[PDB]
Amino acid sequence: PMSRAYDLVVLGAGSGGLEAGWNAAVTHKKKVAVVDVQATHGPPLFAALGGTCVNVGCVPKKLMVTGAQYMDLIRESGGFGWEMDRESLCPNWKTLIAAKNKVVNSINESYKSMFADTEGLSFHMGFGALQDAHTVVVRKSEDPHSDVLETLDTEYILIATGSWPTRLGVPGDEFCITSNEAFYLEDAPKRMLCVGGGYIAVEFAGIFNGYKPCGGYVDLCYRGDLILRGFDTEVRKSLTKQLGANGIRVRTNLNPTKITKNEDGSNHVHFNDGTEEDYDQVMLAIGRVPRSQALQLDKAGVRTGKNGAVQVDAYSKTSVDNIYAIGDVTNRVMLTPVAINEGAAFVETVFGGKPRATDHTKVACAVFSIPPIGTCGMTEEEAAKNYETVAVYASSFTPLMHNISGSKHKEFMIRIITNESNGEVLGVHMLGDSAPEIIQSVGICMKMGAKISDFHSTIGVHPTSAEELCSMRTPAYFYESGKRVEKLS
């Protein structure tokens, strides 16, 4: 029967939202409205049709990291006989941004063709907010007194509005940029400060390092002792070293207290230690918080916790039974394939009749640092707490090509965290070229409950960095009852 205009209204046409909207509309023939604030990428809104990863996230970030890598690859070609004038060779940033804009734009265009050509799936441009459990309002602006454009009468509501960069909140915070503005910079900065120690700060440090003009430099300033909290300790220390050798100055236990604007348009930065310094740009990558604050969630009575995160059960359902929330807005794991999986599971549950909850354990991820990280499962620190007896397997080697390339700092590192009792693999931590590609396949094995014996019984593929996975038999050391031991009782 027809009660309402739509079966489903989706707030946010991102990784989660479009998966949900598309699945609900084509495989279940439901009537689906999808709300987003613009159709094409660009400031001041930044995010658009396709969401954060397509417009100002992993797609454009990966293109720019690929771009930055050519600095290393061009240097390394010399050893192999490639002679070119490397005297003051630095790249054209405008070329990169033009090329990246062209690619993202063509994805935005591809999503418009999807909407126009897909029956029962419609796109509603503006700002979503709830009036009640069955009514979503689309406005011209975020401001709740702005003109109402549409009133969407709907059975189910899916909240998939993702996240937004946190600010520093100090005098001169407004002279700083984020990931959002970094993507639309008119020029590659000569003197770059990346504030933060998360995967975004580190990935962007490597981009600015690759595209810096000829006398330029990148500083990475983190308020803690060691970058990349939540990652393997030895991977974090080895990457810190390898950023150093690539020319990035990593500064620990440091936070800006004050930014002021210089005469020439640069930024004077004061720090904890008393130090003052000038940077052409200062970028903040210090957190991303749910975008729940303009959705009028209290009006409809949807439970908000954490940093404005929407509370859900294993089925991504809110306090209101017809309203669901997925992706970065629910906190949990802020990854694109997770949001897509929750979106898929939401449609299977509510419209498919076949209930499913997204499995958030043993999810592999990557950091597109130079060099990159590939990780799946737990650190030895959290293994040694939750587990009786833990074996740590560890191997570091230098691909022979780096004897020729000159890049002798490029240690490839594998670390396997195991349960000593049954040999079950709890964690795999890799640092080096192709780690993100290798870890995907490792994620499959770990899903199937792979044991260390499954790794070293596999015939190697020679020569690769990945064959070292299948040559780790003897533990480096153990933990019994959460304490590190040389050898086992």
Ligand X SMILES: C[n+]1nn(-c2ccc(-c3nc(CCc4ccccc4)cs3)c(OCCN3CCNC3=O)c2)cc1CCCCN
Query: Is 202 labelled a binding residue?
Result: yes
48 touching ligand FAD, by CB under 6 A: yes
3-state secondary structure of 418: strand
DSSP 33: E
Q: Which of the residues 108 through 147 are near ligand X (CB under 6 A)?
A: 110-111, 113-114, 117-119
Q: Of ligand FAD, ligand X, none, which one does residue 339 interact with (CB within 5 to 8 Å by kind)? A: ligand FAD
Q: Which amino acid is at 415?
A: R
Ramachandran category for residue 120: left, alpha or beta (phi over 0 → left; psi -120 to 50 → alpha)? left
For the bound state, the minimum distance from the C-beta of residue 39 to ligand X, rounded and expressed in Å, comes to 14
Residue of 367, 376, 365 lying closest to 415 (CA atoms): 376
Strand 191-195 and strand 217-221: pairing? parallel
DSSP 177: B
Which tokens in the block code for residue 353? 């009749």
Q: Looking at 107, 294, 357, 401, which residue binds ligand FAD (CB under 6 A)? A: 294
How far is 124 from 40, CA to CA, in rounded Å? 14
Q: Looking at 8, 16, 300, 478, which residue binds ligand FAD (CB under 6 A)? A: 16
66 touching ligand X, by CB under 6 A: no
Q: Which of the residues 25 through 54 are near ligand X (CB under 6 A)?
A: 26
Which tokens in the block code for residue 339? 């949001």
Query: Is 336 labelled a binding residue?
Result: yes
162 touching ligand FAD, by CB under 6 A: yes
Which tokens in the block code for residue 479? 């933990």
77, 82, 199, 246, 384 from 370: Cα distances, Å: 17, 22, 11, 8, 30
Q: Of ligand X, ligand FAD, none, which one does residue 113 interact with (CB within 5 to 8 Å by kind)? A: ligand X
How far is 55 from 107, CA to CA, in rounded Å? 9
Query: Is 13 labelled a binding residue?
Result: no
Stretch of 44-52, 74-82, 109-117, 311-319 lying at the interface with ligand FAD (CB under 6 A)? 44-52
For the bound state, the minimum distance from the C-beta of residue 264 to ligand FAD, rounded and expressed in Å, comes to 29
Query: Is 482 labelled a binding residue?
Result: no
- Measured from the CB atom, is 17 or 189 closer to ligand FAD? 17
Task: Give the bridge partners for 259, in sequence order.
Answer: 269
Q: Of ligand FAD, ligand X, none, which one does residue 12 interact with (CB within 5 to 8 Å by kind)? A: ligand FAD
Q: Looking at 6, 7, 9, 17, which residue binds ligand FAD (CB under 6 A)? A: 17
How would you label 392-431 residue by residue, b for 16+ Cβ within 10 Å and e otherwise? Answer: bbbeeeebeebeebebeebbbbbbbbbbbeeebbbbbbbb
- Measured from the CB atom, is 41 or 191 closer to ligand FAD? 41
22 touching ligand X, by CB under 6 A: yes
Residue of 88, 50, 47 lying closest to 71 (CA atoms): 88
Q: Looking at 45, 63, 90, 107, which residue binds ligand X (CB under 6 A)? A: 107
Stretch of 229-237, 256-264, 290-298, 348-356 lying at the interface with ligand FAD (CB under 6 A)? 290-298
How far is 145 from 480, CA to CA, in rounded Å? 61
Which position has the token pair 């592999």? 364
Residue 402: active-site member: no
Helix (H) or strand (E) holding 203: helix 199-211
51, 56, 119 from 48: Cα distances, Å: 5, 9, 22
Q: Which amino acid is at 320?
A: V
Q: Of ligand X, ligand FAD, none, which one does residue 486 interact with (CB within 5 to 8 Å by kind)? A: none
Q: Looking at 30, 236, 291, 402, which residue binds ligand FAD (CB under 6 A)? A: 291
Which tokens in the block code for residue 93? 């940033």
How far is 361 from 312, CA to CA, in rounded Å? 17
Q: Which of the residues 322 through 341 are near ligand FAD (CB under 6 A)?
A: 327-328, 334-337, 339
Query: Is 15 labelled a binding residue?
Result: yes
- Count of residues near ligand X by CB under 6 A: 13
- Going through 37-126 in order, the beta strands assigned E by DSSP cover 121-125
58 touching ligand FAD, by CB under 6 A: yes
How far is 342 from 159, CA to CA, in rounded Å? 12
Query: Is 268 labelled a binding residue?
Result: no
Query: Is 305 labelled a binding residue?
Result: no
- Measured from the CB atom, is 58 or 114 closer to ligand FAD? 58
Query: Is 487 labelled a binding residue?
Result: no
3-state secondary structure of 456: helix
Query: In terms of C-beta density within 10 A (0-12 exposed, 13-18 middle, 19 or more buried), how is residue 305 classed?
Result: exposed
Stretch of 50-58, 213-221, 381-389, 448-456 lying at the interface with ligand FAD (CB under 6 A)? 50-58
Task: Give the bridge partners for 284, in sequence order.
Answer: 195
Active site residues: 462
Known binding positions: 15-17, 36, 48, 52-53, 58, 61-62, 128, 161-163, 196-203, 222-223, 229, 255, 287, 328, 334, 336, 366, 462
Q: Which residues bind ligand X (CB under 6 A)?
A: 18-19, 22, 26, 106-107, 110-111, 113-114, 117-119
Q: Which residues bind ligand FAD (CB under 6 A)?
A: 11-17, 35-37, 47-48, 51-53, 57-58, 61, 127-128, 160-162, 179, 200, 291, 294-295, 327-328, 334-337, 339
